[PDB]
Amino acid sequence: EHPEFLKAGKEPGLQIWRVEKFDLVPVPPNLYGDFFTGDAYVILKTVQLRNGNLQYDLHYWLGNECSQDESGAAAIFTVQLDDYLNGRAVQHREVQGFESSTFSGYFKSGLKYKKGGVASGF
Amino acid sequence: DVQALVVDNGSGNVKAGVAGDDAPRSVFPSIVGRPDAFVGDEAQTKRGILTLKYPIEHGIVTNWDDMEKIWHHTFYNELRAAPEEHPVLLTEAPLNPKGNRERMTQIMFESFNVPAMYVAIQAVLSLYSSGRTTGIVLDSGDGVSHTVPIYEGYALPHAIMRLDLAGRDLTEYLMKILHERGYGFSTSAEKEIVRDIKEKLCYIALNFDEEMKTSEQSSDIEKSYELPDGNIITVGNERFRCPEALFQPSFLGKEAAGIHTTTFNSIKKCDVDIRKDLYGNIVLSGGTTMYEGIGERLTRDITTLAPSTMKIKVVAPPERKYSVWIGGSILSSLSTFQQMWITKEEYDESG
Numbered sequence: 345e346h347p348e349f350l351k352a353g354k355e356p357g358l359q360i361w362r363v364e365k366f367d368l369v370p371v372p373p374n375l376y377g378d379f380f381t382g383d384a385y386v387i388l389k390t391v392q393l394r395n396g397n398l399q400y401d402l403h404y405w406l407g408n409e410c411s412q413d414e415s416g417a418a419a420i421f422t423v424q425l426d427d428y429l430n431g432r433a434v435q436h437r438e439v440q441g442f443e444s445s446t447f448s449g450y451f452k453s454g455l456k457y458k459k460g461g462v463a464s465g466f
Numbered sequence: 467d468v469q470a471l472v473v474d475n476g477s478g479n480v481k482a483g484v485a486g487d488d489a490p491r492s493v494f495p496s497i498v499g500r501p502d503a504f505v506g507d508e509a510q511t512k513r514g515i516l517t518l519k520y521p522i523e524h525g526i527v528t529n530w531d532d533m534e535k536i537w538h539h540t541f542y543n544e545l546r547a548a549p550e551e552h553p554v555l556l557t558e559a560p561l562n563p564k565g566n567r568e569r570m571t572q573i574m575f576e577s578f579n580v581p582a583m584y585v586a587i588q589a590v591l592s593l594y595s596s597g598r599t600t601g602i603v604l605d606s607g608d609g610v611s612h613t614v615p616i617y618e619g620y621a622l623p624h625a626i627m628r629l630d631l632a633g634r635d636l637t638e639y640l641m642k643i644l645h646e647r648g649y650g651f652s653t654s655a656e657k658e659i660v661r662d663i664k665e666k667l668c669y670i671a672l673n674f675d676e677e678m679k680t681s682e683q684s685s686d687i688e689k690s691y692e693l694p695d696g697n698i699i700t701v702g703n704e705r706f707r708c709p710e711a712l713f714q715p716s717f718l719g720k721e722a723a724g725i726h727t728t729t730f731n732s733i734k735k736c737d738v739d740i741r742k743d744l745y746g747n748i749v750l751s752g753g754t755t756m757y758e759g760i761g762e763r764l765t766r767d768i769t770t771l772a773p774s775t776m777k778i779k780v781v782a783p784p785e786r787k788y789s790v791w792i793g794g795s796i797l798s799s800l801s802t803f804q805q806m807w808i809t810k811e812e813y814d815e816s817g
């Protein structure tokens with residue numbers, strides 16, 4: 345029933361949400377690739393396979409200064425999204441500065457970080 | 467909309483509070499005393515006239531009348547919350563039988579009339595509180611310890627290990643070995659003092675045999691503690707011999723494997739293709755994991771046991787004493803929590 349779940353994984357592309365106050369909030373597309381060190385994010389990459397089905401990779405990205413509610417919520421939302429996608433996503437934990445090559449490769453300009461972030465829900 | 471209550475049904479202490487807080491506001495002993503009934507600290511206050519029972523002594527509820535008294539005390543005496551007006555998240559032990567879960571659900575819906583509830587596995591909540599969906603949780607509490615492999619959010623029940631060896635055994639073992647110095651702690655009240663000595667002074671040796679050798683060469687090991695009556699007790703190698711029983715349960719006369727061996731055996735019950743992710747995410751949870759030195763010692767011991775091409779990481783979060791509760795607070799705060807719970811109406815018509 346959550347509106348962002350209903351939008352998740354419908355078309356090939358890249359969807360990024362930030363944990364804000366115990367909710368999953370879309371990131372403005374202009375900010376893609378620039379992550380607040382103070383925050384946690386959930387990223388769904390959807391790929392079209394030639395056979396016609398969609399392939400899903402879920403990454404949760406943890407900033408070095410994100411609060412425990414944010415990192416915890418990002419992990420939980422990742423599990424819940426995977427369940428909504430019928431378990432067909434692969435889950436990946438991404439820590440600031442140690443992200444996988446696959447994750448980095450989603451961003452043509454590479455990954456960048458920014459001071460600050462949204463306030464903790466705790 | 468409504469705020470959930472979060473109740474972690476600990477073998478030693480209940481941790482309770484409201485969703486969205488960073489720590490439980492209520493922590494009290496999981497004890498019921500009868501000559502009606504007294505719960506928690508007031509029941510200890512009145513040891514002298516009550517018979518005390520631990521209704522969840524090893525993490526599984528065994529006496530439902532006493533457990534209901536604990537839950538009533540939680541809602542009414544601790545939180546001052548109407549349970550019939552709040553969703554409730556309740557925790558359960560790894561490997562809790564489904565029949566026991568069903569009985570707690572019946573009590574919540576039909577004795578407390580909670581409007582909605584969710585039951586979560588303690589170790590899973592702790593893993594989430596660490597910001598992970600995959601890992602193995604070593605949870606060591608008061609009356610029970612478990613190792614719980616979790617993959618992509620879900621515990622793997624064929625690989626969970628239970629140890630009847632946790633903090634209460636360590637308190638009792640410290641009480642025993644202090645007899646070498648002439649102390650005779652034996653009463654309930656004295657056991658609570660020894661528990662505090664354990665928490666203040668004990669630590670885990672990186673290498674037990676070497677620590678025994680270094681400690682006997684000087685009195686640098688000895689550290690002191692002020693008893694309630696003002697006398698000072700001095701403790702030496704008991705500081706690290708007490709929690710050494712986690713690794714060497716033979717010190718307690720138990721044939722069980724230690725916590726390093728148990729962790730290793732749980733990981734090995736999982737298929738080879740996920741073990742790397744478990745070895746790289748060993749997450750400690752619970753009060754009995756709070757000893758200084760534990761992460762370093764576990765790292766050394768599991769590294770020795772595991773294949774040398776594995777990459778062992780032991781994570782010891784600073785707030786791990788209450789990580790179960792904290793994970794429950796996060797989960798029950800999410801905008802999606804409403805879609806996870808079971809409602810009383812549904813239960814009453816098809817439960």
Ligand SMILES: Nc1ncnc2c1ncn2[C@@H]1O[C@H](COP(=O)(O)OP(=O)(O)O)[C@@H](O)[C@H]1O
Nearest residue numbers: 476477478479607608633634665752753754756
């Ligand atoms: N700092 C500490 N060092 C060692 N043991 C501790 C510490 N703090 C608490 N404990 C022990 O942890 C146990 C309580 O842990 P907890 O996780 O609350 O258990 P449970 O959930 O089973 O009730 C007790 O045996 C207590 O003495």
Ligand SMILES: [Ca+2]
Nearest residue numbers: 382383461462
């Ligand atoms: Ca933040």
Ligand SMILES: [Ca+2]
Nearest residue numbers: 431432433434
């Ligand atoms: Ca999956």
Ligand SMILES: [Ca+2]
Nearest residue numbers: 769770772774
């Ligand atoms: Ca080895």
Ligand SMILES: [Mg+2]
Nearest residue numbers: 476477607752
């Ligand atoms: Mg516990």
